[PDB]
Design an enzyme around this catalytic site. Structure first.
Site, mmCIF file in Angstrom:
data_model
loop_
_atom_site.group_PDB
_atom_site.id
_atom_site.type_symbol
_atom_site.label_atom_id
_atom_site.label_comp_id
_atom_site.label_asym_id
_atom_site.label_seq_id
_atom_site.Cartn_x
_atom_site.Cartn_y
_atom_site.Cartn_z
ATOM 1 N N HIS A 41 8.040 -7.475 8.720
ATOM 2 C CA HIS A 41 7.410 -7.979 7.467
ATOM 3 C C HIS A 41 5.884 -7.793 7.497
ATOM 4 C CE1 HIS A 41 7.327 -11.994 9.625
ATOM 5 N NE2 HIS A 41 6.128 -12.021 9.036
ATOM 6 N N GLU A 72 14.122 -7.081 12.480
ATOM 7 C CA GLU A 72 12.767 -7.658 12.215
ATOM 8 C C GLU A 72 11.715 -7.187 13.209
ATOM 9 O OE1 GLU A 72 12.192 -8.579 9.302
ATOM 10 O OE2 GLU A 72 10.109 -9.296 9.596
ATOM 11 N N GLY A 146 0.934 -18.197 10.419
ATOM 12 C CA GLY A 146 -0.100 -17.786 11.382
ATOM 13 C C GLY A 146 0.450 -17.528 12.779
ATOM 14 N N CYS A 148 3.309 -15.765 13.398
ATOM 15 C CA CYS A 148 4.203 -14.571 13.402
ATOM 16 C C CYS A 148 3.606 -13.502 14.307
ATOM 17 C CB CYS A 148 4.552 -14.038 12.019
ATOM 18 S SG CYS A 148 5.694 -15.172 11.171
#
Length: 182
Positions: A41, A72, A146, A148
């Site tokens: 992402h 992911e 914050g 990730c």
């Protein structure tokens, strides 16, 4: 404060950079040579900022499992003039549960942040921001915007990168040795 934090600090000090895309600032783990990982992402493009330096992306691959389900994890090869310490020998070979993990973050917003998250569950399937995702690890800590790309470690293993949370639980994508064979 103890051997878990000591291993986490050793990884952060030598194997992390701050990555900036159009979607934000992320902790980015360097794995070997010029190869690093970031949550998918982050939407990595042709150019990325690495510690506020304009860097060409030589290759980027959003990993999916063989059922063609999102994992992911994006693997990035960076046009950087320096190699990362090779940490592939700290990556697990198989899906597993863990005791006594630490989540470590390094960004402009959260520098030198370490969180003892405790027990890590092989959760498996998660609907992550609407996207069916496999190989998810779960820990019972109220992680926030914050974190990730934050690195999840145990003593002697680098097991995942933080990809989201629901306010009570946090979720990481597994890292497996087989992602980084050459």
């Amino acid at each position: 404060m103890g051997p878990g934090f000591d291993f986490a600090q050793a990884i952060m000090k030598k194997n992390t950079v701050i990555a900036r895309t159009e979607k934000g600032e992320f902790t980015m783990l360097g794995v070997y040579d010029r190869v690093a990982v970031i949550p998918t992402h982050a939407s990595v493009g042709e150019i990325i900022y690495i510690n506020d330096v304009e860097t060409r992306v030589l290759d980027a691959c959003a990993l999916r499992d063989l059922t063609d389900t999102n994992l992911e994890i994006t693997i990035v090869k960076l046009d950087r003039n320096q190699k990362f310490r090779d940490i592939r020998h700290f990556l697990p070979r198989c899906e597993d549960d863990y005791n006594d993990a630490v989540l470590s973050v390094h960004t402009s917003k959260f520098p030198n942040m370490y969180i003892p998250v405790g027990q890590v569950t092989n959760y498996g399937f998660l609907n992550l921001g609407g996207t069916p995702t496999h190989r998810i690890l779960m820990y019972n800590f109220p992680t926030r915007a914050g974190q990730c790309g934050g690195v999840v470690t145990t003593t002697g293993k680098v097991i995942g990168i933080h990809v989201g949370g629901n306010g009570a639980q946090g979720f990481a994508a597994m890292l497996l040795h087989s992602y980084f064979t050459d």
